[PDB]
Swiss-Prot record:
UniProt-listed HAMAP family: ENDOLYSIN_T4
Consequence recorded when altering S117V: 50-fold decrease in enzymatic activity
Protein name, as recorded: Endolysin
Cited InterPro entries: Endolysin_T4_type (IPR034690), Glyco_hydro_24 (IPR002196), Lysozyme-like_dom_sf (IPR023346), Lysozyme_dom_sf (IPR023347), Phage_lysozyme-like (IPR052619), T4-type_lysozyme (IPR001165)
pH dependency: Optimum pH is 7.3.
Subcellular localization(s) per the UniProt record: Host cytoplasm
EC number: 3.2.1.17
Function of the protein: Endolysin with lysozyme activity that degrades host peptidoglycans and participates with the holin and spanin proteins in the sequential events which lead to the programmed host cell lysis releasing the mature viral particles. Once the holin has permeabilized the host cell membrane, the endolysin can reach the periplasm and break down the peptidoglycan layer.
Organism this protein belongs to: Enterobacteria phage T4
Outcome after substituting G30A: Almost complete loss of enzymatic activity
Catalyzed reaction equations: Hydrolysis of (1->4)-beta-linkages between N-acetylmuramic acid and N-acetyl-D-glucosamine residues in a peptidoglycan and between N-acetyl-D-glucosamine residues in chitodextrins
Protein backbone atom coordinates (compact mmCIF):
# COMPACT_ATOMS: atom_id res chain seq x y z
CA UNK A 1 0.00 0.00 0.00
CA UNK A 2 0.95 3.62 -0.73
CA UNK A 3 -0.87 6.95 -1.09
CA UNK A 4 -1.85 6.28 -4.72
CA UNK A 5 -3.36 2.86 -4.00
CA UNK A 6 -5.10 4.27 -0.91
CA UNK A 7 -6.74 7.21 -2.71
CA UNK A 8 -7.61 4.97 -5.68
CA UNK A 9 -9.65 2.81 -3.25
CA UNK A 10 -11.31 5.81 -1.61
CA UNK A 11 -12.05 7.81 -4.78
CA UNK A 12 -12.66 5.18 -7.46
CA UNK A 13 -12.03 5.68 -11.18
CA UNK A 14 -14.63 6.99 -13.61
CA UNK A 15 -13.87 8.20 -17.11
CA UNK A 16 -17.00 10.36 -17.66
CA UNK A 17 -18.01 13.47 -15.70
CA UNK A 18 -19.89 12.46 -12.53
CA UNK A 19 -20.98 14.20 -9.33
CA UNK A 20 -18.98 13.52 -6.17
CA UNK A 21 -20.42 12.89 -2.66
CA UNK A 22 -21.07 16.64 -2.28
CA UNK A 23 -22.83 16.87 -5.66
CA UNK A 24 -19.90 18.55 -7.47
CA UNK A 25 -18.76 17.73 -11.01
CA UNK A 26 -15.72 15.47 -10.92
CA UNK A 27 -13.85 13.06 -13.18
CA UNK A 28 -11.13 10.41 -13.06
CA UNK A 29 -9.78 9.54 -9.61
CA UNK A 30 -11.58 12.22 -7.61
CA UNK A 31 -10.47 15.16 -9.75
CA UNK A 32 -12.85 17.96 -8.69
CA UNK A 33 -13.69 20.05 -11.77
CA UNK A 34 -15.77 22.89 -10.30
CA UNK A 35 -18.34 23.63 -7.60
CA UNK A 36 -20.57 25.23 -10.29
CA UNK A 37 -23.92 23.54 -10.90
CA UNK A 38 -23.49 24.23 -14.67
CA UNK A 39 -22.31 21.15 -16.59
CA UNK A 40 -20.95 23.39 -19.35
CA UNK A 41 -18.71 25.15 -16.81
CA UNK A 42 -17.44 21.72 -15.70
CA UNK A 43 -16.74 20.74 -19.32
CA UNK A 44 -14.71 23.95 -19.81
CA UNK A 45 -12.67 23.15 -16.69
CA UNK A 46 -12.06 19.60 -17.96
CA UNK A 47 -10.89 20.78 -21.40
CA UNK A 48 -8.58 23.31 -19.71
CA UNK A 49 -7.11 20.64 -17.41
CA UNK A 50 -6.53 18.05 -20.19
CA UNK A 51 -5.53 20.38 -23.04
CA UNK A 52 -8.07 19.20 -25.61
CA UNK A 53 -11.81 19.26 -26.27
CA UNK A 54 -12.91 16.21 -24.27
CA UNK A 55 -16.69 16.49 -24.49
CA UNK A 56 -16.92 15.17 -20.86
CA UNK A 57 -14.88 11.98 -21.42
CA UNK A 58 -11.22 11.14 -20.72
CA UNK A 59 -8.86 8.14 -20.97
CA UNK A 60 -7.37 6.11 -18.11
CA UNK A 61 -3.93 7.63 -18.84
CA UNK A 62 -5.47 11.11 -18.66
CA UNK A 63 -7.19 10.27 -15.36
CA UNK A 64 -3.92 8.99 -13.91
CA UNK A 65 -2.10 12.13 -15.06
CA UNK A 66 -4.62 14.35 -13.24
CA UNK A 67 -4.28 12.04 -10.21
CA UNK A 68 -0.47 12.41 -10.09
CA UNK A 69 -0.88 16.18 -10.29
CA UNK A 70 -3.59 16.22 -7.61
CA UNK A 71 -1.59 14.11 -5.14
CA UNK A 72 1.53 16.22 -5.76
CA UNK A 73 -0.57 19.37 -5.21
CA UNK A 74 -2.05 18.03 -1.94
CA UNK A 75 1.43 17.40 -0.50
CA UNK A 76 2.97 20.66 -1.74
CA UNK A 77 0.00 22.48 -0.22
CA UNK A 78 0.38 20.87 3.20
CA UNK A 79 4.04 21.91 3.19
CA UNK A 80 3.13 25.57 2.49
CA UNK A 81 0.64 25.68 5.36
CA UNK A 82 2.30 26.89 8.56
CA UNK A 83 -0.25 25.04 10.71
CA UNK A 84 -0.18 21.73 8.81
CA UNK A 85 3.54 21.42 7.99
CA UNK A 86 4.93 20.88 11.52
CA UNK A 87 2.31 18.22 12.26
CA UNK A 88 2.85 16.48 8.91
CA UNK A 89 6.63 16.51 9.46
CA UNK A 90 6.15 15.01 12.94
CA UNK A 91 4.33 11.97 11.49
CA UNK A 92 5.65 8.63 10.24
CA UNK A 93 5.17 7.75 6.54
CA UNK A 94 1.92 5.77 6.95
CA UNK A 95 0.18 8.50 8.96
CA UNK A 96 1.46 11.07 6.44
CA UNK A 97 -0.66 9.21 3.86
CA UNK A 98 -3.72 9.64 6.08
CA UNK A 99 -3.04 13.41 6.12
CA UNK A 100 -2.63 13.58 2.33
CA UNK A 101 -5.85 11.60 1.89
CA UNK A 102 -7.88 13.93 4.12
CA UNK A 103 -6.47 17.09 2.45
CA UNK A 104 -7.15 15.58 -1.02
CA UNK A 105 -10.79 15.08 0.02
CA UNK A 106 -11.42 18.25 2.05
CA UNK A 107 -8.90 20.84 0.89
CA UNK A 108 -6.61 22.89 3.17
CA UNK A 109 -9.26 25.45 4.10
CA UNK A 110 -11.42 22.36 4.62
CA UNK A 111 -9.37 21.32 7.66
CA UNK A 112 -9.26 24.73 9.39
CA UNK A 113 -11.52 23.54 12.24
CA UNK A 114 -9.23 20.58 13.07
CA UNK A 115 -6.97 22.54 15.47
CA UNK A 116 -7.57 20.19 18.41
CA UNK A 117 -7.04 17.02 16.34
CA UNK A 118 -3.83 18.51 14.90
CA UNK A 119 -2.48 19.10 18.42
CA UNK A 120 -3.28 15.53 19.49
CA UNK A 121 -1.60 14.14 16.36
CA UNK A 122 1.59 16.15 17.03
CA UNK A 123 1.48 14.91 20.64
CA UNK A 124 1.09 11.31 19.31
CA UNK A 125 -2.01 10.84 21.48
CA UNK A 126 -3.41 8.47 18.89
CA UNK A 127 -6.64 7.20 20.45
CA UNK A 128 -7.56 10.73 21.59
CA UNK A 129 -6.88 12.13 18.12
CA UNK A 130 -9.02 9.39 16.55
CA UNK A 131 -11.93 10.26 18.89
CA UNK A 132 -11.60 13.98 18.09
CA UNK A 133 -11.34 13.44 14.32
CA UNK A 134 -14.75 11.68 14.32
CA UNK A 135 -16.51 14.69 15.89
CA UNK A 136 -16.87 16.26 12.45
CA UNK A 137 -19.07 16.91 9.45
CA UNK A 138 -16.43 14.93 7.55
CA UNK A 139 -17.06 11.76 9.54
CA UNK A 140 -20.84 12.16 9.54
CA UNK A 141 -21.09 12.71 5.76
CA UNK A 142 -18.52 10.08 4.69
CA UNK A 143 -18.28 7.66 7.65
CA UNK A 144 -16.96 4.55 5.86
CA UNK A 145 -14.03 6.48 4.37
CA UNK A 146 -13.45 8.59 7.47
CA UNK A 147 -13.31 5.40 9.56
CA UNK A 148 -10.52 4.08 7.28
CA UNK A 149 -8.54 7.32 7.40
CA UNK A 150 -8.96 7.61 11.18
CA UNK A 151 -7.84 3.97 11.70
CA UNK A 152 -4.72 4.82 9.69
CA UNK A 153 -4.05 7.85 11.97
CA UNK A 154 -4.78 5.74 15.07
CA UNK A 155 -2.52 2.79 14.21
CA UNK A 156 0.10 3.89 11.68
CA UNK A 157 -0.77 0.70 9.76
CA UNK A 158 -2.64 -0.13 6.58
CA UNK A 159 -5.11 -2.42 8.39
CA UNK A 160 -8.17 -0.48 7.16
CA UNK A 161 -7.12 -0.96 3.51
CA UNK A 162 -6.40 -4.73 3.42
O1 LIG B 1 -5.52 14.87 8.06
C1 LIG B 1 -5.23 15.79 9.12
C2 LIG B 1 -6.34 16.87 9.17
C3 LIG B 1 -6.11 17.91 10.27
CL1 LIG B 1 -6.05 17.15 11.89
C4 LIG B 1 -3.84 16.41 8.89
C5 LIG B 1 -2.86 16.21 9.86
C6 LIG B 1 -1.59 16.75 9.68
C7 LIG B 1 -1.31 17.50 8.53
C8 LIG B 1 -2.29 17.70 7.56
C9 LIG B 1 -3.56 17.16 7.74
Amino acid sequence: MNIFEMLRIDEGLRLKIYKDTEGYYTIGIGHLLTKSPSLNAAKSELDKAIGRNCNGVITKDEAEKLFNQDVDAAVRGILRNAKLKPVYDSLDAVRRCAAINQVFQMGETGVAGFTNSLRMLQQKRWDEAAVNLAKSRWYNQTPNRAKRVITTFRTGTWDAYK
